[PDB]
Protein backbone atom coordinates (compact mmCIF):
# COMPACT_ATOMS: atom_id res chain seq x y z
CA UNK A 1 0.00 0.00 0.00
CA UNK A 2 1.86 3.05 -1.07
CA UNK A 3 0.69 6.72 0.00
CA UNK A 4 -1.34 8.86 -2.62
CA UNK A 5 -0.95 12.42 -2.29
CA UNK A 6 -4.12 15.30 -1.93
CA UNK A 7 -6.24 12.46 -0.20
CA UNK A 8 -6.03 15.10 2.93
CA UNK A 9 -7.73 18.38 2.16
CA UNK A 10 11.82 12.78 43.61
CA UNK A 11 12.56 11.55 40.10
CA UNK A 12 9.77 9.68 37.71
CA UNK A 13 11.24 6.95 36.24
CA UNK A 14 9.63 6.22 32.84
CA UNK A 15 10.02 3.65 29.71
CA UNK A 16 10.08 5.38 26.07
CA UNK A 17 10.05 2.63 23.19
CA UNK A 18 10.86 4.39 19.80
CA UNK A 19 9.58 2.07 16.79
CA UNK A 20 9.00 2.94 12.91
CA UNK A 21 10.17 2.30 9.79
CA UNK A 22 13.56 1.28 8.95
CA UNK A 23 16.01 4.25 8.20
CA UNK A 24 12.80 6.72 9.44
CA UNK A 25 15.80 8.75 12.04
CA UNK A 26 14.86 6.83 15.28
CA UNK A 27 18.29 6.63 16.76
CA UNK A 28 19.69 10.03 15.78
CA UNK A 29 16.85 10.95 17.10
CA UNK A 30 17.62 9.89 20.35
CA UNK A 31 21.30 10.63 19.89
CA UNK A 32 20.78 14.37 19.30
CA UNK A 33 18.01 14.64 22.49
CA UNK A 34 20.52 12.43 24.32
CA UNK A 35 24.05 13.93 23.07
CA UNK A 36 22.78 17.52 21.67
CA UNK A 37 24.96 16.72 18.46
CA UNK A 38 23.77 15.39 15.06
CA UNK A 39 25.84 11.59 14.14
CA UNK A 40 27.17 13.04 11.04
CA UNK A 41 29.24 9.91 10.52
CA UNK A 42 28.29 6.92 12.17
CA UNK A 43 25.12 5.94 13.39
CA UNK A 44 24.88 2.38 15.50
CA UNK A 45 21.39 0.98 14.40
CA UNK A 46 20.40 0.89 17.84
CA UNK A 47 21.19 3.80 20.59
CA UNK A 48 23.41 2.56 23.60
CA UNK A 49 21.27 1.93 26.63
CA UNK A 50 20.54 5.48 28.15
CA UNK A 51 18.64 7.27 30.52
CA UNK A 52 17.57 10.34 29.99
CA UNK A 53 17.08 13.47 32.63
CA UNK A 54 14.15 15.86 31.66
CA UNK A 55 12.04 18.64 33.58
CA UNK A 56 8.68 19.12 32.19
CA UNK A 57 6.01 21.01 34.30
CA UNK A 58 8.21 21.08 36.98
CA UNK A 59 8.57 17.57 37.21
CA UNK A 60 11.96 15.62 37.51
CA UNK A 61 11.89 12.53 35.25
CA UNK A 62 13.93 9.21 33.84
CA UNK A 63 13.77 8.32 30.65
CA UNK A 64 14.59 5.41 29.58
CA UNK A 65 14.93 5.49 25.89
CA UNK A 66 14.98 1.94 24.14
CA UNK A 67 15.58 2.00 20.54
CA UNK A 68 14.49 -0.53 18.31
CA UNK A 69 15.44 -1.72 14.75
CA UNK A 70 12.72 -0.57 12.15
CA UNK A 71 13.12 -3.38 9.52
CA UNK A 72 10.93 -6.32 8.70
CA UNK A 73 14.08 -8.69 9.67
CA UNK A 74 13.92 -7.70 13.20
CA UNK A 75 10.08 -8.06 13.54
CA UNK A 76 10.49 -11.20 15.98
CA UNK A 77 12.59 -9.96 18.51
CA UNK A 78 11.39 -6.58 18.61
CA UNK A 79 8.47 -7.64 20.71
CA UNK A 80 10.99 -8.02 23.36
CA UNK A 81 11.24 -4.58 23.46
CA UNK A 82 7.64 -3.73 24.41
CA UNK A 83 6.90 -5.05 28.33
CA UNK A 84 6.33 -2.05 31.13
CA UNK A 85 6.46 0.23 28.07
CA UNK A 86 5.32 3.88 29.40
CA UNK A 87 4.97 6.05 26.08
CA UNK A 88 5.67 5.23 22.76
CA UNK A 89 7.73 7.15 19.94
CA UNK A 90 6.20 6.09 16.87
CA UNK A 91 7.70 7.50 13.72
CA UNK A 92 7.60 7.88 9.72
CA UNK A 93 10.05 10.27 7.73
CA UNK A 94 8.82 13.06 6.22
CA UNK A 95 10.46 12.69 3.27
CA UNK A 96 9.35 8.88 2.72
CA UNK A 97 5.30 9.36 2.74
CA UNK A 98 5.19 5.56 2.73
CA UNK A 99 6.57 5.36 5.92
CA UNK A 100 3.84 7.28 6.90
CA UNK A 101 1.44 4.46 5.29
CA UNK A 102 3.12 1.79 7.17
CA UNK A 103 2.02 3.68 10.47
CA UNK A 104 -1.60 2.26 10.12
CA UNK A 105 -0.19 -0.56 8.43
CA UNK A 106 2.45 -2.03 10.69
CA UNK A 107 3.21 0.08 13.47
CA UNK A 108 -0.04 0.82 14.95
CA UNK A 109 -1.22 -2.94 15.25
CA UNK A 110 2.22 -3.92 16.35
CA UNK A 111 2.32 -1.88 19.59
CA UNK A 112 -1.14 -1.91 20.39
CA UNK A 113 -0.74 -5.36 20.08
CA UNK A 114 1.97 -5.26 22.72
CA UNK A 115 1.61 -2.15 23.99
CA UNK A 116 -2.06 -1.91 24.69
CA UNK A 117 -3.17 1.66 26.50
CA UNK A 118 0.14 2.64 26.27
CA UNK A 119 0.05 6.37 24.73
CA UNK A 120 1.30 6.72 21.03
CA UNK A 121 2.90 10.06 20.46
CA UNK A 122 3.01 9.94 16.40
CA UNK A 123 6.67 11.84 15.59
CA UNK A 124 7.32 13.27 11.79
CA UNK A 125 11.00 13.39 11.45
CA UNK A 126 13.45 14.88 9.01
CA UNK A 127 11.29 18.01 9.25
CA UNK A 128 14.16 19.58 7.53
CA UNK A 129 13.49 17.46 4.07
CA UNK A 130 10.36 18.55 3.47
CA UNK A 131 10.52 21.38 1.10
CA UNK A 132 14.30 19.72 0.26
CA UNK A 133 14.89 19.65 -3.67
CA UNK A 134 16.17 16.28 -3.85
CA UNK A 135 13.50 15.13 -2.04
CA UNK A 136 11.04 17.08 -4.22
CA UNK A 137 12.45 15.24 -7.05
CA UNK A 138 12.93 12.01 -6.18
CA UNK A 139 9.42 11.67 -4.50
CA UNK A 140 7.66 13.51 -8.15
CA UNK A 141 9.03 10.97 -10.23
CA UNK A 142 6.77 8.26 -8.06
CA UNK A 143 3.96 10.96 -8.36
CA UNK A 144 4.34 11.63 -4.55
CA UNK A 145 5.49 14.53 -2.20
CA UNK A 146 7.24 15.12 1.53
CA UNK A 147 4.28 14.06 4.16
CA UNK A 148 2.52 17.37 4.53
CA UNK A 149 1.13 18.51 8.38
CA UNK A 150 -1.86 17.64 7.60
CA UNK A 151 -1.32 14.23 6.78
CA UNK A 152 0.57 14.01 10.00
CA UNK A 153 -2.21 15.22 11.54
CA UNK A 154 -4.78 13.11 10.08
CA UNK A 155 -3.23 9.93 10.74
CA UNK A 156 -2.34 10.92 14.43
CA UNK A 157 -6.26 11.38 14.41
CA UNK A 158 -6.74 8.52 12.94
CA UNK A 159 -4.83 6.36 15.49
CA UNK A 160 -6.13 7.99 18.12
CA UNK A 161 -2.14 9.40 19.46
CA UNK A 162 -1.96 11.16 22.63
CA UNK A 163 -0.19 13.61 20.00
CA UNK A 164 1.54 14.43 16.68
CA UNK A 165 4.69 16.73 16.39
CA UNK A 166 7.41 17.17 13.34
CA UNK A 167 11.27 17.30 14.48
CA UNK A 168 14.37 17.48 12.81
CA UNK A 169 17.27 15.43 14.34
CA UNK A 170 19.61 17.72 11.49
CA UNK A 171 18.98 20.83 12.47
CA UNK A 172 17.36 20.28 16.10
CA UNK A 173 13.95 22.08 15.13
CA UNK A 174 11.50 20.45 17.85
CA UNK A 175 13.28 17.53 19.05
CA UNK A 176 13.31 18.46 22.88
CA UNK A 177 8.98 18.82 22.04
CA UNK A 178 8.75 15.50 20.76
CA UNK A 179 10.64 14.14 24.38
CA UNK A 180 8.84 16.87 26.49
CA UNK A 181 5.36 15.43 25.11
CA UNK A 182 6.47 12.36 25.43
CA UNK A 183 7.58 12.80 28.90
CA UNK A 184 3.38 14.31 29.23
CA UNK A 185 1.97 11.33 28.10
CA UNK A 186 3.73 9.32 30.05
CA UNK A 187 3.21 11.19 33.40
CA UNK A 188 -0.10 10.95 33.13
N1 LIG B 1 17.90 15.07 6.54
C1 LIG B 1 17.82 14.32 7.65
N2 LIG B 1 18.37 13.12 7.66
C2 LIG B 1 18.21 12.48 8.85
C3 LIG B 1 17.56 12.97 9.98
N3 LIG B 1 17.61 12.04 10.99
C4 LIG B 1 18.25 11.02 10.50
N4 LIG B 1 18.65 11.23 9.20
C5 LIG B 1 19.40 10.32 8.35
O1 LIG B 1 18.58 9.20 8.11
C6 LIG B 1 19.38 8.00 8.01
C7 LIG B 1 18.84 6.97 8.99
O2 LIG B 1 18.89 7.51 10.33
P1 LIG B 1 18.76 6.55 11.57
O3 LIG B 1 18.58 7.42 12.75
O4 LIG B 1 19.88 5.60 11.60
O5 LIG B 1 17.44 5.75 11.26
P2 LIG B 1 16.77 4.58 12.05
O6 LIG B 1 15.31 4.87 12.01
O7 LIG B 1 17.40 4.53 13.39
N5 LIG B 1 17.08 3.23 11.21
P3 LIG B 1 16.98 1.71 11.75
O8 LIG B 1 15.49 1.40 11.87
O9 LIG B 1 17.47 0.77 10.64
O10 LIG B 1 17.76 1.59 13.01
C8 LIG B 1 20.82 8.41 8.29
O11 LIG B 1 21.54 8.54 7.05
C9 LIG B 1 20.69 9.77 8.97
O12 LIG B 1 21.75 10.66 8.68
C10 LIG B 1 16.98 14.26 9.95
O13 LIG B 1 16.36 14.84 10.84
N6 LIG B 1 17.14 14.89 8.71
MG1 LIG C 1 18.31 2.93 14.33
Same mark, same amino acid.
Given at each position: ???? +????P?????????????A?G???????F +?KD?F????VP?????? !?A %? !????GK??????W???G????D???P???? %???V?? $??? +?ID?? %?S????P?????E????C?????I?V???????? %??H?????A? $??????? +???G?? $????????????????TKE??????? $?????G??
Amino acid at each position: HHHS +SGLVPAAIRKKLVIVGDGACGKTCLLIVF +SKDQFPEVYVPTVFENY !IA %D !IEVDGKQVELALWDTAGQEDYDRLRPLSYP %DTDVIL $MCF +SIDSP %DSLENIPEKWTPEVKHFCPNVPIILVGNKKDLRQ %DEHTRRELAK $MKQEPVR +SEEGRD $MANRISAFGYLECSAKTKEGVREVFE $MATRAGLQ
